[PDB]
Design a protein around this ligand. Structure first.
Ligand SMILES: Nc1nc2c(ncn2[C@@H]2O[C@H](COP(=O)(O)OP(=O)(O)OP(=O)(O)O)[C@@H](O)[C@H]2O)c(=O)[nH]1
Ligand SMILES: Nc1ncnc2c1ncn2[C@@H]1O[C@H](COP(=O)(O)OP(=O)(O)OP(=O)(O)O)[C@@H](O)[C@H]1O
Ligand SMILES: [Zn+2]
Lengths: 471, 611, 466, 191
């Protein structure tokens, strides 16, 4: 019954894991020094929680999953495995090798069925098999009732969900990052608890952000370019870096998963949908979607996010390829730090004073008999940018206290125009909600195409030879 | 010292903080005192100095020193702040504290009685001494040739781990001028700075070795802190204090330096050119100082044996300036964890002490007074561990603890004039800036462990230095058995009864008034009486601060309803009769400048003048 | 639970099912103090106190140290025997974990550098040539149970003698045995040795005294007379189980041992005939490892004969000893004069009689650093034999509480038998009282007076009643 | 590489004065030196010298930079393959790389390489004298993480180079917090 995770025994992330999963008990057991250990521990516990609340003897659709992970599970899985990625061949070869080595040593795991399923598919690519297929989400023609997504950011959420509901699916799950920073139209950000940094294509040559690179120079007073520019706005291309692995993503598909509370799917058949958040821990969320046939209720087109920790978004100045520009950066702040800062933001503080006080509140020296250790609450490299945000916030709130307006009227006079004030910092305190306007009515989903066999003969021969032995 | 010295400066303050205008006790909140930040200005000094030359009657000079001292204070802050860059920190939110206040005291009227002829006052005092102390009144028959007699006989000493140069041991007296006293009390003159006196002072042998930091030592310390926290403290502050450390802060240094006086600031400024960093200053190196005054008590003991020589061990001047900003916070935290019926003399005045014990002591009540001076704290290493454990619980930051600990181990002392080297082991009494605090903590711990739960159920307990008084406690065999684990003379205890055997506390008497019916504390008259028979060194012009101190002390003695009680208290302590006449004699002496001149005489010069 | 007192005598029932060893109850010191029924042993409750804390963490980290009080239960005994029985059982229980913590403390933290703890090392759990070895995981002493981690060895780790006594309480008797407890007084080795040497019975076993004392009588009886008397020792007899009851028991030098231990020892064997306890009570006893004071050491005796003849071992210098330690009834016969000896600086070299035999336990460790080339061994805990030679070392002449006047440490001045006496004590001492004016009592009556008590002492063992 | 006692330098600065691998000689200095051809250029060349302990190894930059492979790349020829590169173990300068190769050609490439920093990486401009003439170039090194964390509060304002040097010596000398057992051990090489 104990659940074992690959976390160091002295890590401070263990306490956060326990409060997020109070129905389990977690014991650390480290076997490898992976650079993204925290990002994998959460995913492991999420799968265990889902399987505990799913009715048994029911088939499950797993979209875009490596089949080597669902081998020892006692449930029924149908893996959809297209071959449009650069690391698919390794996963397929590893799955075949592990399957062959497991034959004859495991009593009841349906190993023989899996072996027969793989051989049948390799003979005819277009065949359909209960445990394996090479179609896409909109091409698979196998009926089920539960669908599971895991770290998928390459599909359109309304279009993909509609095709699943046609086959008769009434439940779905999603595991991944938090979409809220991308709804604010930010340029760069970071998730410090999981050692993840993301940035835009146009700021990859910055100097003082999480993910950048530059070089030394002397500085010249003249240089000409054919691009006038004069406009720095976010684009559709975004780079992700989790640990030491790179992932290219797109903004349009990321924002499509910020579903509203209630929405309708209208087409040949009609459905009514909902969306809830069950687990949230410092950036990772788990979502549950229910689908029913018919058309009921009314829609409002609003999305609500609940903040347990502080959320910051400020404006910074940096040099990109030698030129000084300005953009926006977002991050997360622990709740304990935010509560202890309430006293000093009642006055005006310079950035230097804020930085010094934050350092004192963060670092402590701990002695255990004769050993000495230094302990930190949050990562140190984000302190300078955070200190700037508090200084600006404390100044904007004061100005509202002298220019007091009348109650119930709008000031609009020499000309009938109203002045718009400047804003440089958005700060969301703990126990505060944010609301956004999105779309709730979806009509067109027609995306016809032709299916092409994504496989090669050299790969087919290698798999067949590997799956050739008397057991 | 504590209440008041001979010049009326004392150690306590003069501002009341424990006074209320209601007939009941009211709990209040402890606040902070804001300090004016010093600022630098050179143009003002230049113009004021030139304007000083053209005209300066009396106040023009004073503006120059105020401007000059203010410039020095700003310079010290700028230099001192740069040294401790690795230890400086910022201000964190503070933990609030609360304190109890008491109503104002009530006093009886005073009537002044004095004689007229100052010569008759001397005769009465001399008659009093001869009748009660026959041997003391016949010692003086010639001049003061104590220095010559000390040179004729050799040098006797009992040293341990010391080196000295035998070629510099020579003690021929130098010139000595003084005024012949009129009172026949034979109070000796301060000793001369010679190598013979230094060796005589360091005739103490405390060579004892035990377990330094082993398991048996830790077990004894662990029990001691358990008794202190269980029988003398409440449990509402420990967890909050541990979370918030105490660190060196700019406000601590700014507040500290601003409180220094003129000459003290100038002396500190002269040692800021070659400023060593905080981590470079040694914490286990001391210097030896001799300039003191001999201590004499009533009785006949200084006319038969020579008194001892007092010494001072001075630490590094920079060591006591970097870290002396944390004393105020330590006092506040200690007062917060103590029980309401347990009191400490820190951060009080004379009036506040009277208001606290106004309605607690009544005639026929047993009071236990105990001192711990006669105890060898160097024998056991657990006495130092207990203090550190208490300090750690109070919330002292970890690297600072290492600096403090370095001064409680092996130390060395040196005498600059003669190049004499001394080495000492574990020592508690020193010249560092935590001496009263550690002694007070150990005094409370010893009493708590011995008395067990009898300390909790009490009316009033006061602890300061090496003296304490506890109300409603008698002497039984249980405390003797508990204290006889190692030996028997650890502490000295005395039983006192109000209005029968007056208790003694900090060189004073606790008496219960008759007209009003309240307790009060007064000074010791016999201690003053012997002090007027001390010769005055030539060239001293401090004969005006003493008259004011005597005038204040005389007025407190002549309060109605305390004359009879004072007579019985002195007789029950020293077995002497006839002190009302002495008090009257003191009254006429402190009435005018010329009346104070009758205590001196012609100038006598010895060992000087080639004629 | 409840404690019943039937008509003065006190008996305790063991109805609580808490931790009990053998037939002894375990309870907290605080419980004993808060009970007027147990007011007879309140002194021990105070002593066992000041040793109960709940650990500490930080720079100065320790572990919780809990002490308990042991009392007999189930048997109706006299109130006086209740006091002594509790002291013996309680002391053993507190002694075992004192060593256990010391070994556990070394494991977690770092051993001290300028000490002797380097004799304890960390050893792999496989190579365990040590027959018994101390483990850290369960903080006990175990032979071979695959102690995980890294195992500790040490000096006392080799024989776990502290652990060899914890199980002894299981078979420890509680009911005292009723028997005529008689005893022989006076300096030993005159007739009391000869009672068990020349006129000992068939079924008696020589188990008394130190292991050397057990064997000497066996060699003495066989060489001189015979009678095939075997030899066990007190430590083995008390720890190991007993056999066929002894007819008549002739324990010697038992007054060094604690009274409560003797009470259980007599009842564990149940002697048939009388029991005599020889060996003089005027010497050093069983001391104490933890210095804990003993207050419940009462005495049991039936006879009064004292052997006043004072053997042939004293001298005119110890006439004060005949007036300082004894009241004066110890008039001697000896013709030994030897005016006062301080061994000056260049006196008699290492020779027989000059054997280095210290009598000060706190100075034993300091003996080997200053005096190492003359002789070896110590007889402080082995006194009373026919060694006929003593020499105790000295370091200082100030603040010596270990040996002072009435202390038993000095009392070894008169050599443990008839023999030779020396001391290197500094020529010239602050005080000269013990070597200037000895009492002028009867120095020597006759040699015929000696040959009287050897028959009358036995007459009080044989002809008085049998 | 301070942890492994390794120093590397370019061919043109082997006569420096205050770097890890250099040598020079005493001179008095004269006025004016006539050269043979134009200089006015100091750029890295293709030849680099390594020194591990007391052993020397010559290297070239082109071959060194060819091993910094991206995440995904394609090999096209008579046969086609798809490849990936990952970093498994990293410890203060040593890395272990794992590459998998598969037959076929399908996927997408972006041409980027990512390095994750566990310690501090520093590079700055320094001024030295090479063969008696003053020049300027760049130097890189590694810093332990503990030192970087404790310097956050000091870098909030302008600091003098001599002031910063004294603080660094104080920090390095203080990490030892012992000396009864470990005498004086430093977490940073003093050179
Ligand atoms: N932005 C983004 N993050 C992903 C993606 N896939 C996985 N992750 C996250 O990266 C973290 C670590 O990846 P791994 O668990 O090592 O991936 P794997 O399944 O073991 O196989 P590889 O991708 O070859 O490393 C996971 O916990 C995911 O949260 C993706 O496609 N896009
Ligand atoms: N339309 C789809 N339906 C089902 N699975 C898909 C679909 N598209 C991709 N996948 C699978 O999900 C994973 C993502 O494939 P993708 O083409 O996005 O790789 P990529 O080039 O590295 O881009 P990214 O980093 O955003 O994932 C692949 O393993 C793929 O098999
Ligand atoms: Zn399918």
């Amino acid at each position: 019954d104990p659940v074992y995770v690959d976390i160091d025994a002295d890590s401070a992330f263990l306490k956060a894991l326990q409060r997020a999963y109070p129905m389990f008990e977690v014991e650390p057991r480290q076997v490898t020094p992976n650079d993204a250990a925290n990002a994998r521990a959460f995913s492991h516990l999420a799968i265990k929680l889902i399987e505990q609340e799913i009715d048994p003897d029911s088939t499950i659709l797993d979209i875009g999953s490596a089949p080597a992970r669902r081998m020892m599970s006692d449930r029924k899985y149908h893996c959809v495995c297209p071959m449009r990625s650069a690391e698919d061949p390794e996963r397929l070869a590893n799955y075949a090798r592990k399957l062959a080595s497991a034959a004859g040593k495991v009593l009841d795991r349906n190993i023989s069925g899996k072996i027969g399923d793989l051989q049948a598919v390799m003979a005819v690519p277009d065949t359909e098999t209960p445990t394996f297929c090479l179609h896409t989400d909109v091409s698979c023609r196998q009926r089920a009732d539960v669908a599971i997504y895991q770290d998928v950011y390459a599909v359109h959420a309304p279009t993909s969900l509609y095709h699943q509901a046609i086959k008769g699916v009434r439940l779905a799950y999603w595991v991944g990052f938090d979409t809220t920073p991308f709804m604010y139209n930010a340029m760069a950000g970071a998730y410090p608890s999981y050692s993840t940094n993301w940035a835009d294509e146009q700021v990859l040559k910055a100097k003082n952000i999480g993910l950048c690179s530059t070089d030394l120079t002397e500085g010249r007073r003249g240089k000409l370019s054919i691009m006038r520019g004069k406009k720095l706005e976010p684009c559709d291309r975004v780079l992700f870096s989790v640990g030491s692995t790179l992932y290219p993503e797109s903004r349009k598909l990321l924002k499509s998963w910020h579903l509203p509370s209630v929405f309708h799917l209208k087409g040949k058949l009609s459905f009514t949908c909902r969306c809830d958040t069950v687990v949230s821990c410092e950036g990772y969320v788990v979502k549950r979607i229910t689908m029913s046939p018919g058309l009921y209720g009314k829609t409002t087109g609003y999305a609500v996010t609940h903040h347990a920790d502080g959320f910051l978004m400020c404006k910074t100045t940096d040099t990109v390829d030698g030129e000084r520009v300005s953009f926006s950066v977002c991050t997360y702040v622990p709740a304990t730090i935010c509560d202890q800062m309430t006293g000093i933001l009642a006055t005006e503080v310079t950035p230097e004073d804020a930085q010094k006080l934050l350092v004192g509140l963060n670092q402590r020296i701990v002695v255990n008999g004769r050993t000495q250790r230094n302990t930190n609450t949050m990562k140190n490299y984000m302190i300078p940018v955070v200190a700037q945000a508090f200084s600006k916030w404390a100044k904007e709130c004061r100005k509202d206290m002298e220019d007091e307006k009348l109650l119930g009227v709008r000031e609009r006079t020499c000309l009938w125009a109203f002045k718009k004030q400047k804003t440089h910092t958005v700060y969301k305190r703990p126990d505060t909600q944010s609301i956004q306007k999105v779309q709730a009515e979806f009509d067109s989903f027609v995306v016809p195409s032709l299916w092409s066999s994504g496989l090669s003969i050299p790969l087919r021969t290698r798999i067949k030879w590997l799956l050739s032995k008397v057991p | 010292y504590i209440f008041s010295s001979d010049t009326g400066q004392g150690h306590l303050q003069q501002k009341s903080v424990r006074q209320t205008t209601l007939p009941v006790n009211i709990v209040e909140e402890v606040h902070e005192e804001k300090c004016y930040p010093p600022k630098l200005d050179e143009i003002k000094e230049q113009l004021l100095l030139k304007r000083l030359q053209e005209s300066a009657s009396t106040a023009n000079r004073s503006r120059y020193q105020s401007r000059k001292v203010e410039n020095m204070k700003a310079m010290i802050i700028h230099r001192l702040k740069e040294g401790c860059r690795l230890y400086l920190a910022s201000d964190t939110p503070r933990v609030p504290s609360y304190r109890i206040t008491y109503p104002a005291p009530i006093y009886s009227p005073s009537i002044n009685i004095k004689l007229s002829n100052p010569e008759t006052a001397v005769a009465v005092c001399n008659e009093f001494l001869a009748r009660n102390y026959p041997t003391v009144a016949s010692y003086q028959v010639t001049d003061e040739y104590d220095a010559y007699l000390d040179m004729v006989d050799g040098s006797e000493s009992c040293l341990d781990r010391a080196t000295f140069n035998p070629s510099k041991l020579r003690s021929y007296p130098k010139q000595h001028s003084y005024h012949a006293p009129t009172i026949r009390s034979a109070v000796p003159s301060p000793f001369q700075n010679t190598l013979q006196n230094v060796l005589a002072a360091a005739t103490k042998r405390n060579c004892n070795v035990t377990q330094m930091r082993e398991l048996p030592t830790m077990d004894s310390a662990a029990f001691n802190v358990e008794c202190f926290k269980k029988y003398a403290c409440n449990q509402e502050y420990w967890r909050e204090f541990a979370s918030s450390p105490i660190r060196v802060t700019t406000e601590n240094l700014t507040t500290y330096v601003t409180k220094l006086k003129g000459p003290k600031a100038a002396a500190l400024f002269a040692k800021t050119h070659n400023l060593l960093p905080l981590q470079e200053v040694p914490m286990d190196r001391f210097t030896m100082d001799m300039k003191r005054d001999v201590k004499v008590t009533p009785g006949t003991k200084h006319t038969e044996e020579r008194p001892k020589v007092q010494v001072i061990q001075a630490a590094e001047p920079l060591a006591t300036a970097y870290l002396c900003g944390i004393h105020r916070e330590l006092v506040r935290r200690l007062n917060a964890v103590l029980l309401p019926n347990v009191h400490t003399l820190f951060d009080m005045s004379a009036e506040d002490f009277d208001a606290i014990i106004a309605t607690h002591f009544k005639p026929g009540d047993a009071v236990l007074e105990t001192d711990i001076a006669s105890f060898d704290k160097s024998q056991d290493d657990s006495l130092a561990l207990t203090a550190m454990m208490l300090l750690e619980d109070l919330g002292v930051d970890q690297p600072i603890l290492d600096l403090i600990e370095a001064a409680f181990g092996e130390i060395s002392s040196c005498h600059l004039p003669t190049g004499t080297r001394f080495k000492f082991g574990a020592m508690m009494k020193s010249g560092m800036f935590l001496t009263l605090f550690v002694n007070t903590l150990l005094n409370i711990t010893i009493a708590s462990r011995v008395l067990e739960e009898r300390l909790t159920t009490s009316a009033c307990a006061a602890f300061i230095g090496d003296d304490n008084i506890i109300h409603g406690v008698v002497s039984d065999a249980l405390m003797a058995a508990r204290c006889a684990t190692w030996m028997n003379m650890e502490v000295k205890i005395i039983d006192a009864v109000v209005s029968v055997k007056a208790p003694y506390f900090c060189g004073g008497f606790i008496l219960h008034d008759t007209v009003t019916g309240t307790a009060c504390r007064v000074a010791d008259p016999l201690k003053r009486l012997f002090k007027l028979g001390k010769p005055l060194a030539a060239g001293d012009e401090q004969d005006e601060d003493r008259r004011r101190a005597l005038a204040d002390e005389v007025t407190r003695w002549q309060r109605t309803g305390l004359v009879t009680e004072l007579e019985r208290a002195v007789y029950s302590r020293y077995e002497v009769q006839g002190i009302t006449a002495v008090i009257t004699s003191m009254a006429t002496f402190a009435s005018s400048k010329e009346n104070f001149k009758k205590l001196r005489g012609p100038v006598v010069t010895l060992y000087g003048g080639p004629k | 639970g409840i404690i019943e007192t039937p008509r003065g005598a006190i008996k305790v029932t063991a109805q609580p099912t808490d931790h009990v060893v053998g037939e002894y109850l375990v309870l907290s010191p605080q419980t004993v103090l808060r009970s007027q029924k147990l007011s007879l042993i309140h002194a021990l409750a105070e002593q066992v106190k000041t040793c109960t804390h709940s650990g500490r963490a930080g720079r100065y980290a320790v572990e919780a140290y809990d002490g308990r009080v042991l009392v007999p239960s189930g048997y109706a005994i006299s109130p006086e025997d209740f006091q002594s029985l509790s002291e013996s059982a309680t002391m053993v229980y507190n002694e075992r974990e004192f060593v256990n913590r010391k070994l556990h403390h070394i494991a977690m933290h770092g051993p001290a550098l300028n000490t002797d703890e380097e004799s304890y090392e960390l050893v792999r759990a496989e190579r365990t040539e040590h027959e018994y070895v101390y483990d850290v995981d369960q903080r006990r002493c175990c032979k071979k149970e695959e102690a995980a981690g890294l195992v500790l060895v040490g000096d006392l780790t080799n024989p776990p003698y502290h652990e060899f006594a914890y199980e002894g309480l299981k078979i420890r008797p509680a009911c005292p045995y009723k028997i005529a407890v008689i005893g022989v007084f006076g300096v030993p080795g005159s007739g009391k040795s000869a009672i068990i040497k020349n006129l000992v019975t068939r079924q008696d076993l020589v188990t008394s005294g130190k292991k050397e004392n057990c064997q000497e009588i066996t060699t003495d009886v066989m060489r001189q007379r015979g009678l095939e008397i075997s030899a066990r020792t007190v430590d083995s007899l008390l720890l190991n189980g007993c056999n066929r009851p002894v007819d008549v028991l002739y324990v010697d030098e038992a007054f060094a041992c604690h009274s409560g231990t003797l009470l259980a020892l007599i009842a564990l064997v149940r002697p048939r005939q009388k029991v005599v306890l020889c060996g003089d009570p005027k010497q050093c006893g069983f001391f104490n490892m933890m210095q804990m004071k003993v207050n419940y050491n009462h005495n049991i005796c039936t006879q009064v004969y004292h052997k006043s003849i004072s053997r042939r071992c004293t001298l005119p210098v110890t006439a004060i000893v005949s007036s300082l330690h004894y009241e004066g009834k110890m008039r001697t016969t000896n013709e030994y004069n030897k005016p006062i000896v301080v061994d000056t600086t260049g006196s008699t070299k290492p020779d027989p009689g000059d054997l280095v035999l210290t009598c000060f336990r706190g100075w034993v460790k300091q003996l080997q650093i200053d005096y190492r080339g003359h002789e070896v061994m110590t007889a402080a805990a082995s006194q009373g034999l026919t060694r006929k030679g003593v020499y105790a070392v000295r370091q200082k002449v100030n603040e010596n509480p270990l040996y002072a006047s009435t202390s038993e440490h000095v009392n070894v001045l008169l050599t443990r038998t008839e023999g030779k006496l020396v001391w290197k004590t500094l020529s010239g001492d602050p005080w000269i009282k013990t070597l200037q004016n000895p009492p002028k009592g009867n120095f020597k009556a006759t040699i015929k007076e000696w040959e009287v008590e050897h028959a009358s002492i036995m007459a009080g063992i044989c002809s008085h009643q049998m």
